[PDB]
Amino acid sequence: GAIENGLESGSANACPDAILIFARGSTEPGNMGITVGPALANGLESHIRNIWIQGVGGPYDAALATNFLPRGTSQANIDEGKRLFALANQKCPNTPVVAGGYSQGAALIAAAVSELSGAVKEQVKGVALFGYTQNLQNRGGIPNYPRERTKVFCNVGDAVCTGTLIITPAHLSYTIEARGEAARFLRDRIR
Numbered sequence: 428g429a430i431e432n433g434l435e436s437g438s439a440n441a442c443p444d445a446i447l448i449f450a451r452g453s454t455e456p457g458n459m460g461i462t463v464g465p466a467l468a469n470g471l472e473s474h475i476r477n478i479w480i481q482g483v484g485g486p487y488d489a490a491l492a493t494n495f496l497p498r499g500t501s502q503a504n505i506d507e508g509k510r511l512f513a514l515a516n517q518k519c520p521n522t523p524v525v526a527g528g529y530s531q532g533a534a535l536i537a538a539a540v541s542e543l544s545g546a547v548k549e550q551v552k553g554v555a556l557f558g559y560t561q562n563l564q565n566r567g568g569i570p571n572y573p574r575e576r577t578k579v580f581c582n583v584g585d586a587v588c589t590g591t592l593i594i595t596p597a598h599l600s601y602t603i604e605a606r607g608e609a610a611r612f613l614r615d616r617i618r
Contacts, residue, residue, distance in 0.1 A: 429457025433479030442519040450532030458482025470610025499534030508539030553616030
């Protein structure tokens with residue numbers, strides 16, 4: 428499951444119990460990638476059958492180069508994030524939204540969420556970040572968004588969690604957490 432487009436294809440007359448938006452890591456294929464993303468989608472779908480899963484695609488090509496921009500990805504990538512949260516609130520304003528991101532995707536998701544206002548932000552009930560490349564700069568959180576709704580998985584052995592921009596093997600541990608603890612956290616915020 429590397430590509431998921433359940434929000435872009437879904438009908439506003441069949442809104443689900445929840446919507447998951449996910450941003451993948453640098454170099455990862457499709458719009459979910461092949462590590463943390465499918466594990467989180469699977470974890471969550473095992474607790475909530477009626478769910479739409481949506482990867483962040485469009486301009487987000489998961490390029491290595493974009494990590495070196497302020498906030499850890501490009502503005503066009505952040506804007507695509509924002510567009511998807513807005514589309515969730517237009518189609519399905521009474522449905523809870525949860526979000527996830529891995530590595531560069533975690534930067535994308537943290538920035539997007541920090542710039543939403545009002546009713547679009549309120550609809551976002553939880554966010555799980557894995558290998559958060561802005562962990563130092565943002566002190567383990569998402570600016571302008573409550574800490575009770577945020578769960579950060581940053582292994583102490585993962586270089587990106589202490590400011591060093593390389594692709595690490597820490598996904599091998601994050602996929603276990605995505606399927607378990609992170610899926611439960613997001614389930615609980617949805618419920």
